[PDB]
Amino acid sequence: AAAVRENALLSSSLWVNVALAGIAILVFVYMGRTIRPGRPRLIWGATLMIPLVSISSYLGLLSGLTVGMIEMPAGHALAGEMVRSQWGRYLTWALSTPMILLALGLLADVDLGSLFTVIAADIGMCVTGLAAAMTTSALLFRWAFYAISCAFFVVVLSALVTDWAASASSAGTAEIFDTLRVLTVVLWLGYPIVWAVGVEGLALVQSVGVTSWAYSVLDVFAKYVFAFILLRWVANNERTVA
Amino acid sequence: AAAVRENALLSSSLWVNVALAGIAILVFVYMGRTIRPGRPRLIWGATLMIPLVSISSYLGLLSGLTVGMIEMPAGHALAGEMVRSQWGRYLTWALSTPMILLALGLLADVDLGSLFTVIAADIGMCVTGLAAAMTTSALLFRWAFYAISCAFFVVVLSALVTDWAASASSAGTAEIFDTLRVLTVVLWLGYPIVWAVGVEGLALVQSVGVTSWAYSVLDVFAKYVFAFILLRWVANNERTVA
Amino acid sequence: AAAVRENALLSSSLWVNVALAGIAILVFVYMGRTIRPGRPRLIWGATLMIPLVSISSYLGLLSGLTVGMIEMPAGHALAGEMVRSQWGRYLTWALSTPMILLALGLLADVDLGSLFTVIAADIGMCVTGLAAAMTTSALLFRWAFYAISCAFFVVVLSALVTDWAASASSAGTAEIFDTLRVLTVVLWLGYPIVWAVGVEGLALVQSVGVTSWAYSVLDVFAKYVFAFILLRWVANNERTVA
Ligand SMILES: *C/C=C(C)/C=C/C=C(C)/C=C/C1=C(C)CCCC1(C)C
Ligand SMILES: *C/C=C(C)/C=C/C=C(C)/C=C/C1=C(C)CCCC1(C)C
Ligand SMILES: *C/C=C(C)/C=C/C=C(C)/C=C/C1=C(C)CCCC1(C)C
Ligand SMILES: CCCCCCCCO[C@@H]1O[C@H](CO)[C@@H](O)[C@H](O)[C@H]1O
Ligand SMILES: CCCCCCCCO[C@@H]1O[C@H](CO)[C@@H](O)[C@H](O)[C@H]1O
Ligand SMILES: CCCCCCCCO[C@@H]1O[C@H](CO)[C@@H](O)[C@H](O)[C@H]1O
Ligand SMILES: [Cl-]
Ligand SMILES: [Cl-]
Ligand SMILES: [Cl-]
Numbered sequence: 001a002a003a004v005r006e007n008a009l010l011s012s013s014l015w016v017n018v019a020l021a022g023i024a025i026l027v028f029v030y031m032g033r034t035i036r037p038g039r040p041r042l043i044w045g046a047t048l049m050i051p052l053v054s055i056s057s058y059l060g061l062l063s064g065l066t067v068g069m070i071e072m073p074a075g076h077a078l079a080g081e082m083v084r085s086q087w088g089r090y091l092t093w094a095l096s097t098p099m100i101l102l103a104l105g106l107l108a109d110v111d112l113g114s115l116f117t118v119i120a121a122d123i124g125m126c127v128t129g130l131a132a133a134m135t136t137s138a139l140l141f142r143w144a145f146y147a148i149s150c151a152f153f154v155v156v157l158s159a160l161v162t163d164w165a166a167s168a169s170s171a172g173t174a175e176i177f178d179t180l181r182v183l184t185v186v187l188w189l190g191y192p193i194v195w196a197v198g199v200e201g202l203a204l205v206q207s208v209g210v211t212s213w214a215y216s217v218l219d220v221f222a223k224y225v226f227a228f229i230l231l232r233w234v235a236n237n238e239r240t241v242a
Numbered sequence: 243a244a245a246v247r248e249n250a251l252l253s254s255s256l257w258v259n260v261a262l263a264g265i266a267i268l269v270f271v272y273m274g275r276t277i278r279p280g281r282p283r284l285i286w287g288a289t290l291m292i293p294l295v296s297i298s299s300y301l302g303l304l305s306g307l308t309v310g311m312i313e314m315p316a317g318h319a320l321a322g323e324m325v326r327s328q329w330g331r332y333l334t335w336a337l338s339t340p341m342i343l344l345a346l347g348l349l350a351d352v353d354l355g356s357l358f359t360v361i362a363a364d365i366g367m368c369v370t371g372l373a374a375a376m377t378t379s380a381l382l383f384r385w386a387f388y389a390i391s392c393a394f395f396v397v398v399l400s401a402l403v404t405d406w407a408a409s410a411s412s413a414g415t416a417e418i419f420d421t422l423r424v425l426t427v428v429l430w431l432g433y434p435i436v437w438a439v440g441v442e443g444l445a446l447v448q449s450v451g452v453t454s455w456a457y458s459v460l461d462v463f464a465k466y467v468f469a470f471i472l473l474r475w476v477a478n479n480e481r482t483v484a
Numbered sequence: 485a486a487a488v489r490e491n492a493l494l495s496s497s498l499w500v501n502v503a504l505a506g507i508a509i510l511v512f513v514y515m516g517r518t519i520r521p522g523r524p525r526l527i528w529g530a531t532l533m534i535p536l537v538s539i540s541s542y543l544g545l546l547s548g549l550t551v552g553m554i555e556m557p558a559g560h561a562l563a564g565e566m567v568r569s570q571w572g573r574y575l576t577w578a579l580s581t582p583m584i585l586l587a588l589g590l591l592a593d594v595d596l597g598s599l600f601t602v603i604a605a606d607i608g609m610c611v612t613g614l615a616a617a618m619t620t621s622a623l624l625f626r627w628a629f630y631a632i633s634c635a636f637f638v639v640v641l642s643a644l645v646t647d648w649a650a651s652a653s654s655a656g657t658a659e660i661f662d663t664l665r666v667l668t669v670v671l672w673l674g675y676p677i678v679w680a681v682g683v684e685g686l687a688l689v690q691s692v693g694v695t696s697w698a699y700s701v702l703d704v705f706a707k708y709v710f711a712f713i714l715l716r717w718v719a720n721n722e723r724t725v726a
């Protein structure tokens with residue numbers, strides 16, 4: 001009744017995005033039929049990868065493959081108990097968020113050196129966040145990993161709001177880039193907040209069902225809506241892009 | 243006598259490609275002495291990586307490091323039993339098949355945006371195939387991962403037969419690209435067929451020794467012969483390439 | 485008293501580089517304030533990643549997350565015993581050493597095809613070294629993985645001393661590249677020597693505390709000093725770089 005409820009929250013939060021990522025893929029494929037070869041097409045290709053990885057991630061979680069139990073260390077609000085960790089989320093982020101950055105990079109026509117550094121920071125962010133969730137020896141080390149993950153996040157964010165914006169300005173896409181960059185910054189910021197507030201961090205919210213739904217809602221925006229906005233603009237501005 | 247036989251199939255299927263990848267490396271190194279710096283040399287470098295990763299993979303399997311037992315879920319032809327899974331194959335594919343795609347990409351002088359999307363799809367293909375083999379909770383999830391892996395495969399294939407062919411046409415290598423692309427498409431198609439027919443899928447063939455040999459034969463062609471054909475052509479057409 | 489000592493060696497060898505990587509990051513960030521957008525800035529960005537990954541690695545080891553016990557196989561000097569393996573080092577090398585190569589690649593303005601092949605070889609080097617440490621079935625397979633790792637290392641080294649030097653010559657950075665390339669070759673050579681001499685290889689040195697310190701000292705030079713030299717030169721030669 002709390003377990004019926006917690007289990008009902010968890011499964012619905014996962015099955016919803018299997019459906020939505022599935023539909024996004026179908027929609028995005030259809031939209032690509034009318035998109036002309038060249039830069040518009042390259043962006044579409046990168047963009048389509050985003051829900052492809054996302055739906056994989058959610059099947060990872062649903063199947064039990066990428067979900068485990070983790071013993072919280074002394075000092076944690078749930079010290080001495082096992083908590084369900086959806087570590088599959090952090091893992092697949094390391095592949096899906098570089099696809100987001102690649103679509104943006106193509107859109108803003110960034111320097112390849114900047115692209116490689118950003119994607120590398122992004123992967124560091126994801127792996128250290130995973131380390132934070134997986135660490136059981138001490139509460140200190142969990143939050144130390146969280147802080148390093150934040151430092152990686154700052155590298156990515158800084159690049160977006162400076163060099164990538166600059167690149168977009170001279171590539172003639174600064175207006176759509178700024179929309180998407182603002183969307184990206186706001187929504188990505190939600191993930192470390194969920195982590196911190198949720199059961200793996202401070203556990204202000206102790207329901208893993210609630211924290212799971214929080215990530216799932218963020219994904220709807222940071223992936224599927226982000227991508228739909230991108231593809232709509234590209235399909236309407238193919239010459240600006242080429 | 244079935245176990246003597248199954249064990250004889252397994253070890254021979256693995257030791258043969260330690261030998262063949264070993265020899266391929268030796269041959270390819272020798273061939274590189276006569277290849278001129280620049281684009282020909284870059285292709286040679288990428289090409290040489292292919293059997294380097296391959297021989298690593300086979301030592302992974304031989305040593306027991308990347309082989310495990312997996313319990314088949316209800317509904318599977320071998321439901322309730324443990325089957326030997328050569329999961330090391332899927333793992334190293336995620337590094338060796340991007341090397342194949344990189345050699346082709348250099349040959350066809352493709353757009354870097356296309357290259358990054360293709361290699362990302364390729365990695366998604368490999369990791370979801372690995373997920374399919376590793377999933378034990380339900381038969382549904384195994385085949386769902388298989389279907390996503392196929393979708394990633396289609397992304398890669400589509401890029402080959404369209405944009406990469408286009409790139410090869412304007413880079414003056416469309417004739418050798420078309421040979422290699424056709425080789426690649428036909429042989430790569432064999433892997434999901436082996437998976438499906440073999441013990442991890444439908445188990446029409448229940449011998450892991452037989453399924454292992456099937457992958458090993460595919461590797462001989464998709465890697466070592468593919469690469470030897472590439473290097474022969476490059477060493478004979480260095481100016482067309484430069 | 486040997487355990488007090490071995491444990492004192494181990495923890496000090498790990499905490500020292502948490503401190504030093506931490507300080508390097510702080511120093512490098514400060515130095516970046518005075519570095520002009522463009523190629524100098526791109527190098528700085530790539531360079532800053534190096535201690536970011538390094539400090540992550542050391543927290544991985546300190547927390548117990550990426551340290552495990554491994555049973556040495558028959559024939560090993562410590563056959564039948566469990567030895568502490570800092571496998572987290574090999575793992576994070578697969579992300580930090582591509583950042584070193586990326587900073588150099590930007591500095592020498594190398595061909596992207598060369599860059600991708602080198603970074604791929606570099607990752608192969610790291611993963612097969614990890615395989616070597618993780619392999620328990622036979623002593624033969626441990627050293628076979630070590631030899632393949634060496635072959636990957638040779639690919640990387642060959643590229644540095646030939647094509648990358650060539651690129652640096654025509655990009656006008658051959659003098660600073662040659663310093664850094666020589667630094668890189670000498671210090672990187674120290675790692676397989678430590679492996680071989682230390683407890684995981686021949687165990688001429690059986691103290692894991694001593695072997696850990698050896699890696700930690702190599703890191704100080706191959707990462708933090710390497711990077712400080714790079715940033716000093718870039719900040720003093722911004723026009724040569726642009
Ligand atoms: C599609 C998935 C997305 C856009 C996920 C983005 C995730 C992040 C920006 C996560 C950030 C984190 C930190 C910055 C600190 C450590 C905890 C994390 C991993 C949640
Ligand atoms: C050198 C190794 C090669 C060329 C391996 C290629 C492997 C594939 C094309 C595998 C494809 C698969 C699917 C498309 C569905 C899921 C099962 C796989 C991973 C066998
Ligand atoms: C910052 C970390 C660095 C620069 C580490 C570099 C590590 C190597 C060059 C390791 C090389 C190895 C071999 C060449 C053989 C197998 C054992 C290794 C992994 C130590
Ligand atoms: C996100 C910015 C603040 C980070 C918190 C610093 C680490 C504190 O750590 C927290 O201490 C609490 C006990 O006091 C517990 O309730 C939490 O479970 C534990 O994570
Ligand atoms: C490859 C295209 C067809 C995929 C098969 C769909 C999934 C069916 O699944 C299969 O069902 C069988 C029992 O009927 C078993 O024999 C198999 O082990 C099991 O994989
Ligand atoms: C690094 C170049 C030499 C590699 C050594 C070849 C592999 C030998 O292997 C070694 O054999 C010894 C027993 O004779 C043991 O002391 C070692 O633990 C074992 O690694
Ligand atoms: Cl994802
Ligand atoms: Cl869950
Ligand atoms: Cl392989």
Ligand SMILES: [Cl-]
Nearest residue numbers: 252303309328
């Ligand atoms: Cl096997």
Ligand SMILES: [Cl-]
Nearest residue numbers: 538541576580
């Ligand atoms: Cl590291």
Ligand SMILES: [Cl-]
Nearest residue numbers: 494545551570
């Ligand atoms: Cl340790």
